Design a binder for this molecule. Structure first.
Ligand SMILES: [Zn+2]
Length: 140
């Protein structure tokens, strides 16, 4: 589980979104496994605005923050998980690392802020849904 709280936005994995999230929907994209909802309270998270490919992500299944190198956001085939069929996912970044389904929503950060959230796993890779292109999270 996990979310990004930037301004009056909450960013979650679309597959983990709640009824409240859907009742307060701003934007969602199945192909990216992202959903953004509106919040009453101001969040304090900063979204990274950069092309960094090194960062640190939180892995709940190991209670560990792992430094990782990660790929550029791309359209990648993802094998079946417990929450999606085998399919293409867009704006996805891969690293070598541990990811179980319960690790979805772990934050990946660099010196510039939040890069993305864990969205995929298996075959010894961890996949992160990028958020750095969503410049509208910074305003309004
Ligand atoms: Zn960065």
């Amino acid at each position: 589980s996990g979310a990004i709280y930037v301004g009056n936005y909450r960013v979650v994995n679309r597959h983990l979104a709640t009824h409240n999230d859907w009742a307060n929907l701003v934007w969602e994209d199945s192909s990216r496994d992202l959903l953004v909802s509106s919040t009453t309270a101001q969040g304090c998270d900063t979204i990274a605005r950069c092309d960094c490919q090194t960062g640190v992500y939180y892995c709940s299944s190991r209670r560990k923050h792992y430094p990782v190198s990660f790929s550029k956001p791309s359209l990648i085939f993802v094998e079946a998980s417990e929450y999606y069929p085998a399919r293409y996912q867009s704006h996805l970044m891969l690293a070598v690392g541990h990811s179980e389904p319960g690790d979805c929503g772990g934050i990946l950060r660099c010196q510039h802020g939040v890069v993305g959230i864990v969205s995929t796993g298996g075959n010894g890779l961890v996949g992160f849904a990028d958020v750095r292109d969503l410049l509208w999270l910074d305003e309004e």
